[model samples]
Target chain A: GQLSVDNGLWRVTLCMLAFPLLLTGLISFREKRLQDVGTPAARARAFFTAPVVVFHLNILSYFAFLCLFAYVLMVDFQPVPSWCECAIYLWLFSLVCEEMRQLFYDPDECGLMKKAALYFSDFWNKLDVGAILLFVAGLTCRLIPATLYPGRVILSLDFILFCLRLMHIFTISKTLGPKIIIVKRMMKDVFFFLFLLAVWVVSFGVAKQAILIHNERRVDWLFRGAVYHSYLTIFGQIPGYIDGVNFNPEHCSPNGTDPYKPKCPESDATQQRPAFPEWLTVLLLCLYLLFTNILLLNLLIAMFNYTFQQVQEHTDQIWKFQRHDLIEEYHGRPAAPPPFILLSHLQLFIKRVV
Target chain B: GQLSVDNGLWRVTLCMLAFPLLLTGLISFREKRLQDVGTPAARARAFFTAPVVVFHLNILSYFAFLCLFAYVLMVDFQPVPSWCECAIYLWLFSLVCEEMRQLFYDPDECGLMKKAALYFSDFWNKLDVGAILLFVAGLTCRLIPATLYPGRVILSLDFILFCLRLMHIFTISKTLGPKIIIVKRMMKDVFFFLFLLAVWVVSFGVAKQAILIHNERRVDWLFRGAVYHSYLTIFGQIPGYIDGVNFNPEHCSPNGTDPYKPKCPESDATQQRPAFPEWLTVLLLCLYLLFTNILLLNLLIAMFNYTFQQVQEHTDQIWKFQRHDLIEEYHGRPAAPPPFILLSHLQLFIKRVV
Candidate 1:
């Protein structure tokens, strides 16, 4: 199997299009109910507002998931490259801009271009201008041998920017409340799982390369290949060539010999031996099954259960109308009828029956 | 100063007698005012009930403090100790007993012996019985050298007991409302401070003995003395004598001959030494000042501050009543006029006219 699959472009594109379509359908359904009751312009406004709101929310959520995934990856995987770090910073800045836009402009009122302009201005004032200036200062200091203190100052500023972005997530949650906030959080967790899977696949690719380079005299590459092969087998069913390699006769013994010399080339047959020790393969299989199948599945179930419970509880409270007593007591008083004696007099025709 | 203080007899006697007399005086004062206003048996009941109620509340609080202190000293602080964990448990048990006693016995009406019994029983049931049983079980295991599994079971039981006590505190707070139930919590912090002080004092005494032994150059006692002194210095304070031991001699030639005796005895009449090395005396004095004047003062201030803030907040909330709208709406129906409103209406009209 190919180790990578178009760097998540396919899944992302599908999600982006599907989400907007679903949102548009929902908005149209709501607008149809309102169409007969409102002016054409007002109905159009209502129809446009719902989809715009959903689109903005979806974009913000997607960026939030990306930033969270980047943060967790940086922490878990040490010594990430400088270019990747720069990309992460830019993505985080985008998220911060989106959050600021949501705070200032109502999606229903503001057009996309105006909202984007507001977001850009907010970014300049809140983060980007300062971050760019700091980065420039850091780069200049790198060229000048005498600029030790300036380099330190730049690093400190970057740390402060990271902290501000971290706090922005909570700020958004407080403003949006739980319903919209939790969906983004769950999306971030899903992205984290995907990131983990990508790392595993990349490691397997590197291990296969190592195995092909070293095949004889108990070399280190043989150990590396074996480990990678074990990981691949445990994670997914091995495909044709990889599965066939496990039973290859030439690589099975120290002296290369082919059981079927005419059918397969000697080099191909030599490359077909199992890369890892049997015990290691079994151990890796057990670990992968336990972690991916049992542990991760249970964790996902628990997270869903908790998210559902929170949403249900909040909905119940909001819809139950438990807070109406204050309004009833203070806002407007109900009128009372005349005494029971007057009512009895009015009912005099029915008194004989009573 | 002498450790004996009139055998604590006079202080105890004075407190016991004076408290009752003070109660009687307070009752008489209230009675005189009530009698003028025409109230029923208020004076007589105050004379009797005030002393009893005060005594019961005092005794229960004191006993709780004592039991908690003992548990911390004997069990939690024995070798592998955790002070904070034990303090939380002790506080919770005491709180539960205080709350539960209110459910079964009315403080205003209960007889002295009955109140005392109720207090003891509640305390025992909530906390002491488990503590005593655990202690007995632990001792039995030690004597009998029980199986490893049984030892683990005993430990598990102790942990469960601790958790049970914690739950009681949580349940009572939730049921009673945090504001109404946190009065004794302030007192618990005060008790905790006292417990810390007692431990420090005891350790200080041990350190003083160790220092004396060290000075006498009992070589075999050197390690023991050093250990005890280190413990005290870390946990309590340093002594004055160690700081005073001087290495320098006045009038030493380049040949390393001392003009004075090589080692001057404390009792020697010819020895004209400054009472102690100025630096050592100053260091010891500074340490004494820090412990007694700074640390102890801060501890006292913290105790007062926490109590004062908690009590003030509670009292303000109790007095500044905001009637909930549900209760108000329930009473506001036009068909019902509760008895007190008529009297209140008359009072309002009279005040307005006057």
Candidate 2:
């Protein structure tokens, strides 16, 4: 009874609700009075919607969102009746509404198709849409007990996109902005390198798998050994299977009934030796290492070098362009941050109704 | 005895030896006659050592060396009195003498220090010395039975460097030359990225390994779980230890004596579940994945982009500069290739004796 008496629920409820409502009312009154006084709409808008004001507010809002999101994922970990998850949903709702505003705010009197195209033209805008869509999907899945686990997984992935959106905030910084451009280009380089590597990885994995293991039928474990083991081998994590030097009868499942481990080779029973010629496998490995580790890796390095040097040469121009995008984004943003921005949306609704 | 009778060793040896010796004699005679006519020394030298001739001869010689090296390592598989091995040693000796010629050649009447400095100024020259040194070490170790395996490993690694030196020949190609430069710069970018990645990888591995396994004493397996597993985890090859869903009594060694697989968790006995909090490990893993797969990986991409663009901007200039190095190297090279170059060295020896 004593613990319940000092719960402070009432105090929290009042402070959270009343203070924000009062500030919203005050903002509405000031804006109406400014309009009545014939203040230019642009100047009146600048009072709250200045780039500096919106930028800082948005950043703080994003930081708050991250803290809450992390807390829910790490602690609450489910769509249970939690106040933090409630706050995150409300914040995401506000972001979705902002995206809507961006889509409809047509300066050139374009059709909906053109306006949508314009909205999606920015990469951050596309990421925001994708994140919101993922959130919606996660929320839908979370509502069903059957899909709750996968729903959480989806939410976790959405968090990655949200976190990447933080890079948009960093674009205002002279130092980090251009670096982001370089990173984007390098990602393209990585994708190309991955394509080249897959050819080598898959081929080696196929031959090596058939060489070492007999009829590995499980696609999951098959791929695990083929691609995963082969790739790691290039970095010197040589498996003990090829040489059979580390094969102990005690370490393996005799009949390969174990889902987690490969079956001991048949030859292990006869002489406790590898079934295939170690020389052929070792030579194949050496050649694979030479091609993949030395040649292909060096080629990737070359591609990256070219990409980095290209970006560094024009860092100044790139940063200036990025800064323009940052300024333009914040200039159009509402004066209030996420949860508080709901009040701004409510105010717009009342204006439309009136 | 019948197989040996049909060996044709005597005829093979005579043809291999007499033909090249006859050519060497004819060249010497023509060069001497040219000198007697008071022909320009540069003209006389160019007759045999033109860039076209030297380039083609060197390439063929390198191809021969690679073939022999591969045959010895793959088919013979050891230094077991094989003729191919013998040829390789002779070829390597010729390369060593060529390096000596490079080190001592004084074009500007520079002192020994400057001459050595000029030789080492080129990256390929440094790689050449390094590969030769590794070969020497491998050869020394090969003579001893105990260290033979590790010695061969060293030689195998040296092959990578030698193969990379093949790019030096590629520098003469207008298209591929600048690409080599980009690859070099990207490698530097990779080294820097590796340093950054190591911090995250090692820290995550340390925490994850400790959380999962108690007192993992084997440094080999400790690093395996810590660094290797952590790195692969980012690529999505998640181990079942954290969740403990895949833990089966029959799969893991009950006593934890298995060197290859991790010990079963203590809780697996009582409840067949993980000892550590699954939530904590999973959360840590998610956080690790985000930082590594998203943040650090993107940072690497950016570095690569910067490097690539930088090199690409000056590709023409870089290629031209690289071409000069190639031309300069070939212009001064002896008229013969490898074993044939041994003849040139003998000619030098004869001059000194006289």
Candidate 3:
């Protein structure tokens, strides 16, 4: 309960509301200027009004469902000790159905109800349904006074959900190639994808092995803690380090300790210990750290670096070539005997005389 | 002496000569038709000639050295029980010098004699040279028969070599990007260059590590064995796998024994064992086999399958566009209604009837 409420629901809701209002205001402001330019006001009005309204409505509905799910999570429920498990299945089914409909139907042809259903379904599918289900099932089995058979059923469901999640992510990359494809550049992309996949598989296997070997009873807690710490290290801490942001003891310290504490034994001990000893813990930490920091951050850097380099090199080369073209355009003859050539000839003559 | 002659020199010589020749012949024969067309003839000729000459020279020189080294090993020479240690230094010096020359200079520009001097100069600049020279001086002292520092010198040399080799390979990879860049695509050229570099690093490291770890008196033999085996795996074995060629027993196993036999039985045993006592080896083996054979293989197949499917869809779209273009070319314009208009009319009629 003390954990931050600034998770997915609050962020998604705020984003959904803010984006539409911003879009409406910007479009309305731009449309007034277009009317002064003697363009038909109807076209400008249509451009600004219709699409924004539709998109805003869709976004609102998406957030509403997310809010509902978040509420469900917060409240206690029955029909099962694990209402969350049922919620996960419902979410997954809704999402998958939506994606399938979107794939088949043209947006213009689809009815409003159909479009809404499809959107909701797609949203549900994108959520971590398998993981959520597993979490709910595992928790329910531990907490509820159910028969042995029901507990086994819940465990089996959780296992199946996990396998499905693994299949979905791993197979998607293999199936879809890489997310981005530029002409004449597939090999590098493919190699990178394969390299990332290999690293992932190796890390996954090792972490899984470690967890199973440790055989801790509070496995989920271990996993959650590891994931949180790793997330902080990779995305939160590393970026701050790179940005030259000094550590603020007021924020980072467990008890708001003094910033200039010479030797904090507790913090030192924590830092010295391995991040995650259990396999599940390691796996969770690796997932968060790798996805957020290693994979995503590195990919962003690579994309920016490649784009910037290309832009600079292309502009320089093109500018030089254009200058040559302009010279040719003006003079109608090539320049001869540059300064370096004359200098070299004089040096050769001096050497011969000596 | 029998073992050395039978298992070591003769088999290596046979494999070295036969496999390369066979491979060259096959490639040449395959490209015979291409000799009649375009510029491939000159390129193919160069390809066929260069590797054959390189391999011939390499094998011949290596075998000659092996024979001489074997004789030195057999004879208990110069009143030193650590005569093998001298052979180790000489062999390592020769190998390192050869590698250094290869890395720093083009063979055509600097002749072998000049390359050798350059290599020695470069080697003297490194910390490795000091340790190697110390080992050599210690060996000389031991050979005088008055006093022997064999124990101390042998261990020091072993540790120094191990560290040096490890640093050399690891740093080289760090310097060179993990993936080789292809400036121009020349049929396996980049792969071959990378393969050669990998072999050089891996063989050097493995041989040095084996020599250091093993307490045997036969230092030269162990070093030779490790390097040769590593070389064979890269050049001989991997190529065979890629080519889909059947294993050449005559080349690989000339002495009728398992060529790539397990070196460390203890390590192998540990890898095979289960993490938990309750977990059976059979279960672990089954899981491993399933994961490796089924899961990994299936993922690869799925990747290729998706790629091919995308290709097929693209081809079909191209054909449709081409057919449309052909109709326009032949008839100026189609007499029939466009497909989209026809579909629209059909949809309208269906809607009206319903």
RMSD of each: 35.2, 14.7, 34.9
CAPRI grade, predicted model 3: incorrect
What does candidate 3's lDDT look like per residue over A184-244, in tens digits?
1344465676577556544644453353345556757655654444444432342212333
Question: Order the candidates by lDDT, highest first — what do you get?
Answer: 2, 3, 1
- Which stretches in model 2 have alpha-carbon errors above 4 Å? A1-50, A79-81, A105-110, A175-196, A224-275, A294-329, B1-354
lDDT of 1 by residue, A1-354 (tens): 011223333333443355443233222233344523545455434433333233334445555544453332323222233555555445555444443433443527767687677656753254755755675565555335454323333333343343333323222221222332334335445556545544564465444444334433332323233322332333344411244432323322233355545443234232254544433344444544555446544665565555544443453344335335323422221111111123433353265358
Output the chain A TM-score of model 3: 0.27
In order, what DockQ does each candidate have?
0.00, 0.04, 0.01
lDDT of 2 at B130: 85
Residue A320, candidate 2: C-alpha displacement in angstroms: 4.8
* Number of the candidate with higher TM-score, 1 or 3: 1
* Local accuracy of candidate 3 as per-residue lDDT tens digits, B38-67: 354454334334332333344445554444
Superposed model 1: Cα runs more than 4 Å off? A1-125, A132-153, A165-354, B1-48, B55-71, B74-76, B79-98, B101-354
- The Cα local distance difference test for each model comes to 0.40, 0.62, 0.41
True contacts kept of each: 0.00, 0.00, 0.00
- By descending TM-score, how would the candidates be arranged? 2, 1, 3
